[PDB]
Protein backbone atom coordinates (compact mmCIF):
# COMPACT_ATOMS: atom_id res chain seq x y z
CA UNK A 1 0.00 0.00 0.00
CA UNK A 2 1.42 3.60 -0.36
CA UNK A 3 -0.29 5.87 1.68
CA UNK A 4 -1.38 9.70 1.77
CA UNK A 5 0.69 12.01 3.72
CA UNK A 6 -1.73 12.80 5.87
CA UNK A 7 -3.04 9.51 6.33
CA UNK A 8 0.04 7.87 7.23
CA UNK A 9 0.95 10.65 10.05
CA UNK A 10 -2.32 9.90 11.56
CA UNK A 11 -1.12 6.44 11.83
CA UNK A 12 1.90 6.87 13.01
CA UNK A 13 0.09 9.23 15.69
CA UNK A 14 -2.12 6.79 17.12
CA UNK A 15 0.61 4.29 16.94
CA UNK A 16 2.76 6.04 19.20
CA UNK A 17 5.50 6.77 17.28
CA UNK A 18 5.44 11.01 17.70
CA UNK A 19 8.00 12.09 20.35
CA UNK A 20 8.89 8.05 20.72
CA UNK A 21 12.83 8.51 22.33
CA UNK A 22 12.33 11.64 21.40
CA UNK A 23 12.10 11.46 17.76
CA UNK A 24 9.03 14.13 16.22
CA UNK A 25 6.67 12.73 14.02
CA UNK A 26 7.97 14.95 11.11
CA UNK A 27 11.19 13.20 11.67
CA UNK A 28 9.23 9.80 11.22
CA UNK A 29 7.18 10.98 8.18
CA UNK A 30 10.78 12.35 6.68
CA UNK A 31 12.52 8.88 6.87
CA UNK A 32 9.77 6.85 5.61
CA UNK A 33 9.21 9.43 2.80
CA UNK A 34 12.73 9.19 1.60
CA UNK A 35 13.27 5.41 2.10
CA UNK A 36 10.13 4.10 0.77
CA UNK A 37 8.05 7.23 -1.03
CA UNK A 38 5.21 6.06 1.69
CA UNK A 39 5.42 2.41 -0.05
CA UNK A 40 4.51 -0.88 2.06
CA UNK A 41 5.99 -3.08 -0.53
CA UNK A 42 9.03 -1.39 -0.97
CA UNK A 43 12.31 -3.51 -1.12
CA UNK A 44 16.23 -2.86 -1.60
CA UNK A 45 19.05 -5.71 -1.90
CA UNK A 46 22.46 -5.33 -0.79
CA UNK A 47 25.07 -7.19 -2.98
CA UNK A 48 27.58 -6.31 -0.58
CA UNK A 49 26.51 -8.30 2.59
CA UNK A 50 23.71 -10.53 0.98
CA UNK A 51 20.81 -8.23 2.98
CA UNK A 52 17.60 -6.75 2.37
CA UNK A 53 16.00 -3.81 3.46
CA UNK A 54 11.97 -4.28 3.63
CA UNK A 55 8.88 -1.92 4.03
CA UNK A 56 8.23 1.90 4.42
CA UNK A 57 10.67 2.08 6.79
CA UNK A 58 13.27 -0.24 4.44
CA UNK A 59 14.05 -2.46 7.90
CA UNK A 60 17.08 -5.03 6.94
CA UNK A 61 17.34 -8.63 7.20
CA UNK A 62 20.59 -8.83 8.51
CA UNK A 63 19.83 -7.78 12.43
CA UNK A 64 16.44 -7.01 12.58
CA UNK A 65 13.69 -9.65 10.57
CA UNK A 66 14.39 -12.92 9.36
CA UNK A 67 13.73 -13.34 5.66
CA UNK A 68 15.56 -16.84 5.70
CA UNK A 69 17.93 -15.95 3.21
CA UNK A 70 20.36 -13.31 4.89
CA UNK A 71 23.59 -14.76 6.25
CA UNK A 72 24.50 -14.26 9.79
CA UNK A 73 21.27 -13.15 10.57
CA UNK A 74 19.63 -11.94 13.62
CA UNK A 75 16.43 -11.59 14.01
CA UNK A 76 15.89 -8.63 16.94
CA UNK A 77 12.81 -7.86 15.94
CA UNK A 78 11.71 -11.24 16.28
CA UNK A 79 9.38 -11.49 13.12
CA UNK A 80 9.49 -12.06 9.38
CA UNK A 81 10.88 -9.60 7.02
CA UNK A 82 7.27 -10.56 5.23
CA UNK A 83 5.42 -9.05 7.67
CA UNK A 84 7.34 -5.76 7.09
CA UNK A 85 5.47 -5.70 3.36
CA UNK A 86 2.31 -5.45 4.49
CA UNK A 87 -0.48 -3.25 4.22
CA UNK A 88 -0.84 -2.70 8.33
CA UNK A 89 2.40 -1.02 9.62
CA UNK A 90 1.73 -2.12 12.99
CA UNK A 91 4.34 -4.72 12.70
CA UNK A 92 6.87 -2.10 10.95
CA UNK A 93 5.85 0.37 13.65
CA UNK A 94 7.18 -2.02 16.68
CA UNK A 95 10.13 -2.87 14.65
CA UNK A 96 11.10 0.44 14.06
CA UNK A 97 10.72 1.20 17.69
CA UNK A 98 12.98 -1.19 18.22
CA UNK A 99 15.69 -0.36 15.97
CA UNK A 100 15.74 3.38 17.60
CA UNK A 101 15.86 1.43 21.71
CA UNK A 102 19.43 1.10 20.26
CA UNK A 103 22.33 3.96 21.16
CA UNK A 104 22.28 5.07 17.62
CA UNK A 105 18.41 6.04 17.47
CA UNK A 106 17.09 7.20 13.91
CA UNK A 107 20.59 7.66 12.78
CA UNK A 108 21.06 3.78 12.03
CA UNK A 109 19.31 4.73 8.69
CA UNK A 110 21.78 6.73 6.27
CA UNK A 111 18.68 7.99 4.77
CA UNK A 112 17.38 9.85 7.74
CA UNK A 113 21.11 11.55 8.15
CA UNK A 114 21.56 12.75 4.32
CA UNK A 115 17.98 14.00 3.84
CA UNK A 116 16.46 14.87 7.22
CA UNK A 117 19.01 15.17 10.03
CA UNK A 118 19.44 19.22 10.84
CA UNK A 119 16.95 20.44 8.06
CA UNK A 120 13.45 21.65 8.08
CA UNK A 121 11.07 18.46 8.21
CA UNK A 122 8.12 21.09 9.13
CA UNK A 123 6.94 20.34 5.45
CA UNK A 124 5.80 16.56 6.41
CA UNK A 125 3.27 17.00 8.85
CA UNK A 126 1.72 20.26 8.08
CA UNK A 127 -2.18 20.50 6.95
CA UNK A 128 -2.49 16.94 8.42
CA UNK A 129 -3.95 18.02 12.44
CA UNK A 130 -1.44 15.90 13.88
Same mark, same amino acid.
Given at each position: ?6 ? %??? +? %???? /? ?7 ? %?????? %? ?10 ? +????? *? ?20 ? +? ?21 ? $? ?5 ? $????? *? ?20 ? /?? *??
Amino acid at each position: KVFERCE %LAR +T %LKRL /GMDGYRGIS %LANWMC %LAKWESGYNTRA +TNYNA *GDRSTDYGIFQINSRYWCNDGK +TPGAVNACHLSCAALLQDNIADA $VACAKRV $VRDPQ *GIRAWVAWRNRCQNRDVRQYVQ /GC *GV
